[PDB]
């Protein structure tokens, strides 16, 4: 029960998948604008 | 028997998207909040507050809560057939006889989907199971075999705090569902515990309940429990208001967007009742412009009867007739006449309105109004006339405003300098003010000094738009 | 499973730190 | 068929405001009851005027004659509908039954208006609808009548409409915009003065001349003032018979202020004694005065009151409460001193408020639709 | 709580009340309140 | 009535203010009269004379008002009173308001950068 705390609290921090989802989308966007 | 199909339908539409829907939105979801059926279910809570909830009467007694509380099981995919068991029991209200199995038989019913099986892992099914049956019961407080069951049903919701802080071996983020419920129902807690008396150990329930939402789930708890604490200390006397003065941690993401509004109204009443004009009236202003809609009558009207009282104490106040609901008109009959007594400089009227409606001023209960309202009369007069004339005499304003002597007028000028309205001196022999207005004061750099805050404020809002662009 | 429950999400944290840094550089190239 | 009934509006206002002549209305309006078979001047004056000691059988034999005309209407309508006339007998019964609403109360309305309300088939069969409700909505303090029938006329009667009668609608809407204090729409709606010589709706064109002057003394700008009362002569001659009015306007172009007090006080005496003003003329006079004062302040900067008391009389402590309240009414941008006696003209726009209004909108607007931008979230 | 029939449904204010308190009054009226002096 | 503007409602109140030893507190009330006189004797005033020190101050002349002429940096004029020769000590404060606003241009212009 000791360190059963923080890893789901790091799964809280998977908004970087969402913010960097927008950044990955944007990479595709302007990358293919360039292409 | 033709109307109860409507709670039969909307009930199943609630626990469909909520139970199966938000449980499916809770299994692995919600990087921040993918459980849109949390907020959808709260919109159905508002629907149950607009409508009758489910079975307060509904032409029968006690139909849905003995019915739907059973048989979820969370098993092999023939548990949609358990939803078919939920649906096909509706020939009991339609064809059969309805029977009384609420408020007395709910006490094992709440154990029943837990006693079907070890049903499922996530606690929003349990808080759904002790909220969505029991929250239809909290709004019938006729104080006769119905408030003790609000009492006990919210002891089961105390067992939802117990099954909130001690669930998922710590930190699955279902508070972002359950505090979404444990906002609303906890207010109902402080409703029903204050339907009879002041609560004193529910103060402590609230205290440790604030402490569990400290850091591991600082999401929707701290602000709503902060409202319960604020209205606790507000309904009670003024002793614990130095708390925010030392523990000012009152700043969430302000998600609910009405919680932040009426919350900032409430601490507006706090700083108002301490002593404050400017900050108090500008969060009266800010909470006033954050008043959501006109979708609830009266709740802005009476709260706005209480909103502009510090502006009644400014002396610079207009009369709220476009705010005036005509249903509020019969209740602002003292209050229209109160601000009538404000702008009139009469004294017999000043004590005549207080004399006439001191009982409604007790319903106000904010008699710091009257201790400084005569003071507000003399500040409005000196603000108007001091604003008017550059070199007036104190004998001019004095024996017009019935001051009868020069020396207390010199005390008015003295404490007006001390309060800093005008730079009025005295041609010091016996009074007889020599003074000035103040124009040619400055007008050019001083505005573009303010434009640092206008446009630094604008770039604040700019980065609010960039972070607003961070959403999709 | 607190042996390596704690550790493994950091391995999948560093890399998106690097591209989180790096998308600004590539967009900075696409300005060029 | 409106003008003596517009005099009935005049005369119910005579019943209403002047209690100096506490019974002039029963004199000339009961004089209007014994003629025209009008039974209203003891219905409403039975309710509103005096105790009516005895006029009972003398006016109920004519209420009996009102019943006789009413029942030969109630025989002419079905004894005439044998002919195939599209709303023609309906026109015959709405003329004399809306004229019964002229004779009687709103019973004449409900047997008249609501009866001819539905099978309106032509323009005059809606022109008499909208006009012949505008009369009674004007006679009473009613607002849904005179606004909403004209809303119907904007819908029904027009489809583009006649040039003339839509200007007549502009005249009726101008009468509401002078009932309410709608300054630009009164004078702007009274712009033509061409198609309105004397209709059956116009019991006096000179009253219409008063109606346009009493608002063109507020809303009209000074180049617009010379554009109307000086560049336009079509109104000049019918107020050339009103030379004190014309004197007040040219004085208003001159800013001589004692004749402002005189003829403005006379205009106030009329303003007491004219309907559709009583809820409104409190705003009038002082606004009139600040309409004079500002250009007075545009005269120059460091003014003394004695130079003003030449044009004012004893305007020393008069302008104390007057000018101090006009400053205190959020108006009259100046500063004032007693003994050094500084008067101030300023208010340079490119200063702060032109810089202010956009964020005045875009703060409650910003938090408003920003608040709308979070309903999507939770 | 909107549970009824209803879901179909200082600048110059404090001064619109005092200015609606003296509604037929003599707030200004120069030639009246100013030249009642020398009329007798 | 204190904050209404009557320091003589003090002496009208002290006619019957014992109030079970409400004597020390009304002496400290006299203190909060006199040190506020030490604030409000020339706040935005031209000057006063001795009789104003007889009215607002009391006890005619102790060495406490002579102390008031010799504690705060006071100009005891000949039957005359001054805070200073100027009472305000020459306010210009910078005579240069511009360069610190260029420091506002330093950090503010930096704030315009890093964002878009």
CSV table of C-alpha atoms in Angstrom, one decimal, chain D residues 1-196:
chain,number,residue,atom,x,y,z
D,1,UNK,CA,-64.4,59.6,-38.0
D,2,UNK,CA,-61.6,59.9,-35.6
D,3,UNK,CA,-61.2,63.7,-34.9
D,4,UNK,CA,-64.0,64.3,-32.4
D,5,UNK,CA,-62.9,61.1,-30.8
D,6,UNK,CA,-59.4,62.5,-30.7
D,7,UNK,CA,-61.1,65.4,-29.0
D,8,UNK,CA,-62.5,62.7,-26.7
D,9,UNK,CA,-58.8,61.8,-26.0
D,10,UNK,CA,-58.3,65.6,-25.4
D,11,UNK,CA,-61.3,65.6,-23.1
D,12,UNK,CA,-60.6,62.5,-21.1
D,13,UNK,CA,-57.2,64.1,-20.5
D,14,UNK,CA,-59.3,67.2,-19.6
D,15,UNK,CA,-61.0,64.9,-17.2
D,16,UNK,CA,-57.7,63.5,-16.0
D,17,UNK,CA,-55.1,66.2,-15.3
D,18,UNK,CA,-56.9,69.7,-14.9
D,19,UNK,CA,-58.8,69.7,-11.7
D,20,UNK,CA,-58.9,73.5,-11.9
D,21,UNK,CA,-61.8,72.8,-14.3
D,22,UNK,CA,-62.9,69.8,-12.4
D,23,UNK,CA,-66.0,69.3,-14.6
D,24,UNK,CA,-65.1,70.8,-18.0
D,25,UNK,CA,-65.1,67.3,-19.4
D,26,UNK,CA,-68.7,66.6,-18.5
D,27,UNK,CA,-69.6,70.0,-20.0
D,28,UNK,CA,-68.2,69.7,-23.5
D,29,UNK,CA,-67.9,65.9,-23.5
D,30,UNK,CA,-71.5,65.4,-22.2
D,31,UNK,CA,-72.2,68.0,-24.8
D,32,UNK,CA,-70.5,65.4,-27.0
D,33,UNK,CA,-72.7,62.7,-25.5
D,34,UNK,CA,-76.0,64.3,-26.3
D,35,UNK,CA,-74.7,64.6,-29.9
D,36,UNK,CA,-73.3,61.7,-32.0
D,37,UNK,CA,-75.3,59.3,-29.7
D,38,UNK,CA,-72.1,58.8,-27.7
D,39,UNK,CA,-72.9,56.8,-24.6
D,40,UNK,CA,-69.2,56.5,-23.4
D,41,UNK,CA,-69.2,60.0,-21.8
D,42,UNK,CA,-71.3,58.7,-19.0
D,43,UNK,CA,-69.9,55.2,-19.0
D,44,UNK,CA,-66.3,56.1,-18.3
D,45,UNK,CA,-67.3,59.4,-16.8
D,46,UNK,CA,-69.8,57.4,-14.7
D,47,UNK,CA,-66.7,55.5,-13.6
D,48,UNK,CA,-64.1,58.4,-13.6
D,49,UNK,CA,-66.0,61.7,-13.4
D,50,UNK,CA,-68.5,63.0,-10.9
D,51,UNK,CA,-71.3,61.2,-9.0
D,52,UNK,CA,-73.9,62.0,-11.8
D,53,UNK,CA,-76.8,63.4,-9.7
D,54,UNK,CA,-79.4,62.9,-12.4
D,55,UNK,CA,-78.6,62.3,-16.1
D,56,UNK,CA,-79.9,58.7,-16.0
D,57,UNK,CA,-83.1,58.5,-18.1
D,58,UNK,CA,-82.1,61.4,-20.3
D,59,UNK,CA,-79.1,59.4,-21.5
D,60,UNK,CA,-80.6,55.9,-21.2
D,61,UNK,CA,-83.4,56.9,-23.6
D,62,UNK,CA,-80.4,57.5,-25.9
D,63,UNK,CA,-78.8,54.3,-24.7
D,64,UNK,CA,-82.1,52.9,-25.8
D,65,UNK,CA,-81.7,54.8,-29.1
D,66,UNK,CA,-78.1,53.4,-29.0
D,67,UNK,CA,-79.8,50.0,-28.8
D,68,UNK,CA,-82.1,50.9,-31.7
D,69,UNK,CA,-79.3,51.8,-34.0
D,70,UNK,CA,-77.4,48.8,-32.6
D,71,UNK,CA,-80.2,46.4,-33.4
D,72,UNK,CA,-80.9,47.8,-36.9
D,73,UNK,CA,-77.2,47.1,-37.2
D,74,UNK,CA,-78.1,43.7,-35.8
D,75,UNK,CA,-80.7,43.3,-38.5
D,76,UNK,CA,-78.9,45.1,-41.3
D,77,UNK,CA,-76.0,42.7,-41.0
D,78,UNK,CA,-77.9,39.5,-41.6
D,79,UNK,CA,-80.6,41.2,-43.8
D,80,UNK,CA,-77.8,42.5,-46.0
D,81,UNK,CA,-75.5,39.4,-46.1
D,82,UNK,CA,-77.9,37.8,-48.5
D,83,UNK,CA,-75.9,39.6,-51.2
D,84,UNK,CA,-72.6,37.9,-52.2
D,85,UNK,CA,-70.2,40.6,-51.0
D,86,UNK,CA,-66.8,39.7,-49.8
D,87,UNK,CA,-66.6,41.3,-46.3
D,88,UNK,CA,-68.8,44.1,-47.7
D,89,UNK,CA,-71.6,43.7,-45.2
D,90,UNK,CA,-68.7,43.0,-42.8
D,91,UNK,CA,-67.5,46.5,-43.8
D,92,UNK,CA,-71.0,47.9,-43.2
D,93,UNK,CA,-71.1,46.4,-39.7
D,94,UNK,CA,-67.5,47.2,-38.8
D,95,UNK,CA,-67.9,50.9,-39.8
D,96,UNK,CA,-71.0,51.4,-37.6
D,97,UNK,CA,-70.0,48.9,-35.0
D,98,UNK,CA,-66.5,50.2,-34.6
D,99,UNK,CA,-68.4,53.4,-34.6
D,100,UNK,CA,-70.4,51.8,-31.8
D,101,UNK,CA,-67.0,51.3,-30.1
D,102,UNK,CA,-66.8,55.1,-30.7
D,103,UNK,CA,-70.3,55.3,-29.2
D,104,UNK,CA,-69.9,52.8,-26.4
D,105,UNK,CA,-67.2,51.0,-24.5
D,106,UNK,CA,-64.9,48.0,-25.3
D,107,UNK,CA,-68.1,46.0,-25.7
D,108,UNK,CA,-68.3,47.9,-29.0
D,109,UNK,CA,-64.7,46.8,-29.5
D,110,UNK,CA,-65.3,43.1,-28.9
D,111,UNK,CA,-68.4,43.1,-31.0
D,112,UNK,CA,-66.5,45.3,-33.6
D,113,UNK,CA,-62.8,44.6,-33.6
D,114,UNK,CA,-62.6,40.9,-32.9
D,115,UNK,CA,-65.5,40.4,-35.2
D,116,UNK,CA,-64.0,42.0,-38.3
D,117,UNK,CA,-60.6,40.8,-37.2
D,118,UNK,CA,-60.4,37.5,-39.0
D,119,UNK,CA,-61.9,37.8,-42.4
D,120,UNK,CA,-59.9,40.9,-43.4
D,121,UNK,CA,-59.6,40.5,-47.1
D,122,UNK,CA,-58.4,43.8,-48.5
D,123,UNK,CA,-56.2,46.7,-47.6
D,124,UNK,CA,-58.9,49.0,-46.2
D,125,UNK,CA,-60.3,46.0,-44.5
D,126,UNK,CA,-56.9,46.0,-42.7
D,127,UNK,CA,-56.3,49.8,-42.8
D,128,UNK,CA,-59.4,50.4,-40.8
D,129,UNK,CA,-58.4,47.5,-38.5
D,130,UNK,CA,-55.0,49.0,-37.7
D,131,UNK,CA,-56.1,52.6,-37.7
D,132,UNK,CA,-59.4,52.0,-35.9
D,133,UNK,CA,-57.4,50.2,-33.2
D,134,UNK,CA,-54.7,52.9,-33.1
D,135,UNK,CA,-57.5,55.3,-32.2
D,136,UNK,CA,-58.6,53.5,-29.1
D,137,UNK,CA,-55.1,52.5,-28.1
D,138,UNK,CA,-54.3,56.1,-28.4
D,139,UNK,CA,-57.4,57.2,-26.4
D,140,UNK,CA,-56.4,54.9,-23.6
D,141,UNK,CA,-53.0,54.2,-22.1
D,142,UNK,CA,-52.7,51.0,-24.0
D,143,UNK,CA,-49.5,50.0,-25.6
D,144,UNK,CA,-50.1,46.5,-27.1
D,145,UNK,CA,-52.9,48.0,-29.3
D,146,UNK,CA,-51.0,50.9,-30.9
D,147,UNK,CA,-47.7,49.0,-31.2
D,148,UNK,CA,-48.9,45.6,-32.2
D,149,UNK,CA,-51.6,46.5,-34.7
D,150,UNK,CA,-48.9,48.6,-36.4
D,151,UNK,CA,-46.7,45.5,-36.2
D,152,UNK,CA,-49.5,43.8,-38.1
D,153,UNK,CA,-49.6,46.6,-40.6
D,154,UNK,CA,-45.9,46.3,-41.1
D,155,UNK,CA,-46.6,42.6,-41.8
D,156,UNK,CA,-50.0,42.5,-43.4
D,157,UNK,CA,-50.8,45.9,-45.0
D,158,UNK,CA,-47.5,46.6,-46.7
D,159,UNK,CA,-45.9,44.0,-48.8
D,160,UNK,CA,-44.0,47.1,-49.8
D,161,UNK,CA,-47.2,49.1,-49.4
D,162,UNK,CA,-48.4,52.5,-50.5
D,163,UNK,CA,-46.2,55.5,-50.2
D,164,UNK,CA,-49.0,57.5,-48.5
D,165,UNK,CA,-50.5,55.3,-45.9
D,166,UNK,CA,-47.2,54.0,-44.7
D,167,UNK,CA,-46.2,57.5,-44.0
D,168,UNK,CA,-49.5,57.7,-42.1
D,169,UNK,CA,-48.1,54.7,-40.1
D,170,UNK,CA,-45.0,56.8,-39.6
D,171,UNK,CA,-47.3,59.5,-38.2
D,172,UNK,CA,-48.9,57.1,-35.7
D,173,UNK,CA,-45.5,55.7,-34.7
D,174,UNK,CA,-44.4,59.3,-34.3
D,175,UNK,CA,-47.2,59.8,-31.9
D,176,UNK,CA,-46.0,56.9,-29.8
D,177,UNK,CA,-42.4,58.2,-30.1
D,178,UNK,CA,-43.7,61.5,-28.6
D,179,UNK,CA,-45.8,59.6,-26.1
D,180,UNK,CA,-42.6,57.9,-25.0
D,181,UNK,CA,-39.6,60.2,-25.0
D,182,UNK,CA,-38.1,58.9,-28.2
D,183,UNK,CA,-36.6,62.1,-29.5
D,184,UNK,CA,-34.9,61.1,-32.8
D,185,UNK,CA,-37.9,59.0,-33.9
D,186,UNK,CA,-40.5,61.7,-33.1
D,187,UNK,CA,-38.7,64.4,-35.1
D,188,UNK,CA,-37.3,62.0,-37.7
D,189,UNK,CA,-40.7,60.4,-38.1
D,190,UNK,CA,-42.2,63.9,-38.5
D,191,UNK,CA,-39.9,64.7,-41.3
D,192,UNK,CA,-42.2,64.8,-44.3
D,193,UNK,CA,-45.1,67.2,-43.3
D,194,UNK,CA,-46.3,66.7,-46.9
D,195,UNK,CA,-48.9,63.9,-47.0
D,196,UNK,CA,-50.6,65.0,-43.7
